[PDB]
Design an enzyme around this catalytic site. Structure first.
Site, PDB file in Angstrom:
ATOM      1  N   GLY A 144       2.804   4.150  -1.537  1.00  0.00           N
ATOM      2  CA  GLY A 144       3.134   4.703  -2.840  1.00  0.00           C
ATOM      3  C   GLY A 144       2.248   4.225  -3.975  1.00  0.00           C
ATOM      4  O   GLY A 144       2.191   4.876  -5.023  1.00  0.00           O
ATOM      5  N   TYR A 158       0.750  -1.254   0.000  1.00  0.00           N
ATOM      6  CA  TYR A 158       0.000   0.000   0.000  1.00  0.00           C
ATOM      7  C   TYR A 158       0.782   1.308   0.000  1.00  0.00           C
ATOM      8  O   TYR A 158       0.173   2.359  -0.196  1.00  0.00           O
ATOM      9  CB  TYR A 158      -0.989  -0.003   1.172  1.00  0.00           C
ATOM     10  N   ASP A 189      -2.199  13.056   6.329  1.00  0.00           N
ATOM     11  CA  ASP A 189      -0.748  12.984   6.198  1.00  0.00           C
ATOM     12  C   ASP A 189      -0.067  12.974   7.560  1.00  0.00           C
ATOM     13  O   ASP A 189       0.895  12.229   7.776  1.00  0.00           O
ATOM     14  CB  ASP A 189      -0.261  14.168   5.396  1.00  0.00           C
ATOM     15  N   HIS A 239      -3.794   5.337   5.362  1.00  0.00           N
ATOM     16  CA  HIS A 239      -3.612   6.619   4.690  1.00  0.00           C
ATOM     17  C   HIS A 239      -4.376   6.600   3.385  1.00  0.00           C
ATOM     18  O   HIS A 239      -5.012   7.593   3.011  1.00  0.00           O
ATOM     19  CB  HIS A 239      -2.121   6.855   4.452  1.00  0.00           C
ATOM     20  N   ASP A 240      -4.335   5.468   2.697  1.00  0.00           N
ATOM     21  CA  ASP A 240      -5.069   5.312   1.455  1.00  0.00           C
ATOM     22  C   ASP A 240      -6.561   5.498   1.764  1.00  0.00           C
ATOM     23  O   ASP A 240      -7.281   6.222   1.084  1.00  0.00           O
ATOM     24  CB  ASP A 240      -4.824   3.926   0.852  1.00  0.00           C
ATOM     25  N   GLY A 257      -0.783   1.637  -3.130  1.00  0.00           N
ATOM     26  CA  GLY A 257      -1.743   0.689  -2.596  1.00  0.00           C
ATOM     27  C   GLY A 257      -2.851   0.340  -3.562  1.00  0.00           C
ATOM     28  O   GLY A 257      -3.032   1.000  -4.581  1.00  0.00           O
ATOM     29  N   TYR A 293      -1.248  22.272   1.905  1.00  0.00           N
ATOM     30  CA  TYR A 293      -1.821  22.693   3.177  1.00  0.00           C
ATOM     31  C   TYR A 293      -0.713  23.309   4.008  1.00  0.00           C
ATOM     32  O   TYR A 293       0.456  23.208   3.653  1.00  0.00           O
ATOM     33  CB  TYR A 293      -2.465  21.499   3.917  1.00  0.00           C
ATOM     34  N   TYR A 301      -7.448   9.167   2.438  1.00  0.00           N
ATOM     35  CA  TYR A 301      -7.610   9.927   1.204  1.00  0.00           C
ATOM     36  C   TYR A 301      -8.945   9.539   0.568  1.00  0.00           C
ATOM     37  O   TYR A 301      -9.630  10.375  -0.026  1.00  0.00           O
ATOM     38  CB  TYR A 301      -6.452   9.636   0.237  1.00  0.00           C
TER      39      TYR A 301
HETATM   40  C1  LIG Z   1      -8.673   3.930  -0.763  1.00  0.00           C
HETATM   41  O1  LIG Z   1      -7.436   4.133  -1.448  1.00  0.00           O
HETATM   42  C2  LIG Z   1      -7.093   5.308  -2.088  1.00  0.00           C
HETATM   43  C3  LIG Z   1      -8.037   6.079  -2.757  1.00  0.00           C
HETATM   44  C4  LIG Z   1      -7.683   7.266  -3.410  1.00  0.00           C
HETATM   45  C5  LIG Z   1      -6.361   7.719  -3.416  1.00  0.00           C
HETATM   46  C6  LIG Z   1      -5.365   6.880  -2.696  1.00  0.00           C
HETATM   47  C7  LIG Z   1      -5.767   5.714  -2.069  1.00  0.00           C
HETATM   48  C8  LIG Z   1      -4.032   7.534  -2.817  1.00  0.00           C
HETATM   49  C9  LIG Z   1      -2.794   6.933  -2.169  1.00  0.00           C
HETATM   50  C10 LIG Z   1      -1.382   7.520  -2.211  1.00  0.00           C
HETATM   51  O2  LIG Z   1      -0.805   8.001  -3.176  1.00  0.00           O
HETATM   52  O3  LIG Z   1      -0.694   7.462  -1.068  1.00  0.00           O
HETATM   53  C11 LIG Z   1      -4.308   8.747  -3.624  1.00  0.00           C
HETATM   54  C12 LIG Z   1      -3.335   9.806  -4.067  1.00  0.00           C
HETATM   55  N1  LIG Z   1      -5.633   8.753  -3.902  1.00  0.00           N
HETATM   56  C13 LIG Z   1      -6.169   9.933  -4.403  1.00  0.00           C
HETATM   57  O4  LIG Z   1      -5.629  10.954  -4.046  1.00  0.00           O
HETATM   58  C14 LIG Z   1      -7.431  10.235  -5.174  1.00  0.00           C
HETATM   59  C15 LIG Z   1      -7.675  11.604  -5.272  1.00  0.00           C
HETATM   60  C16 LIG Z   1      -8.788  12.095  -5.931  1.00  0.00           C
HETATM   61  C17 LIG Z   1      -9.683  11.211  -6.508  1.00  0.00           C
HETATM   62 CL1  LIG Z   1     -11.124  11.845  -7.365  1.00  0.00          CL
HETATM   63  C18 LIG Z   1      -9.457   9.844  -6.422  1.00  0.00           C
HETATM   64  C19 LIG Z   1      -8.336   9.348  -5.754  1.00  0.00           C
END
Ligand SMILES: COc1ccc2c(c1)c(CC(=O)O)c(C)n2C(=O)c1ccc(Cl)cc1
Length: 121
Positions: free
Chosen positions: A29, A27, A89, A47-48, A31, A64, A51
Site C-alpha cells: 500500500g 511495502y 497484479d 509488486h512495487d 512501499g 485491464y 510497477y
Molecule cells: C519500485 O517501487 C514502486 C515504483 C512505482 C510505483 C510503486 C512502487 C507503486 C506501488 C503500489 O501502490 O502498490 C505505484 C502505484 N507506483 C506507480 O504506479 C508509479 C506509476 C507511474 C509513475 Cl510515472 C511512477 C510510479
C-alpha cells in the site's frame, strides 16, 4: 487499476485489499524502503518493483481485462501497459494466496520508522 487489483486480491484470498493489504508491513500500500517484514510484505516489494519496470504506465488508474480459467487468472489482450500491469497484479494476488499461511495482522498499519534502508529490485 487499484480497484480491479483490489477485487482480484479479494477473489484470490478472501481478504479485503483494504485494509488487509493497503498498509501491511513496509511495502504493501505504500512501499518505499526497509527490509520486507515477511513473505506477504515481500509480495508487495516485488509488486512495487514490477510497477517500477513500467515508468510510463499508470497502474492505479489504467484498467485491464482478465478472465478465470478454472481458477487460473489469464490476462487478456489490451494495450502493452495494460498487459504488463495485469501480469504484475496477477503475480501479487497469487503471491498473497501462497503466503496466507504466514499472514500476520500485527503488520497491519506498520510504522514507517521501522522500515530503513533501500533494498534493490
Ligand atoms: C519500485 O517501487 C514502486 C515504483 C512505482 C510505483 C510503486 C512502487 C507503486 C506501488 C503500489 O501502490 O502498490 C505505484 C502505484 N507506483 C506507480 O504506479 C508509479 C506509476 C507511474 C509513475 Cl510515472 C511512477 C510510479
Amino acid at each position: 487499476s487499484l480497484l480491479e487489483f483490489g477485487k482480484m486480491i479479494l477473489e484470490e484470498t478472501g481478504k479485503l485489499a483494504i485494509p488487509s493489504y493497503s498498509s501491511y508491513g513496509c511495502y504493501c500500500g505504500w512501499g518505499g524502503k526497509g527490509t520486507p517484514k515477511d513473505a506477504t510484505d515481500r509480495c508487495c516489494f516485488v509488486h512495487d518493483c514490477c510497477y517500477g519496470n513500467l515508468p510510463d504506465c499508470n497502474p492505479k488508474s489504467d484498467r485491464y481485462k482478465y478472465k478465470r480459467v478454472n481458477g487460473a487468472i489469464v490476462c487478456e489482450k489490451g494495450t502493452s501497459c495494460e498487459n504488463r500491469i495485469c501480469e504484475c497484479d496477477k503475480a501479487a494476488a497469487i503471491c498473497f494466496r501462497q503466503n496466507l499461511n504466514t499472514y500476520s495482522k500485527k503488520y497491519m498499519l506498520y510504522p514507517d520508522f521501522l522500515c530503513k534502508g533501500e533494498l534493490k529490485c
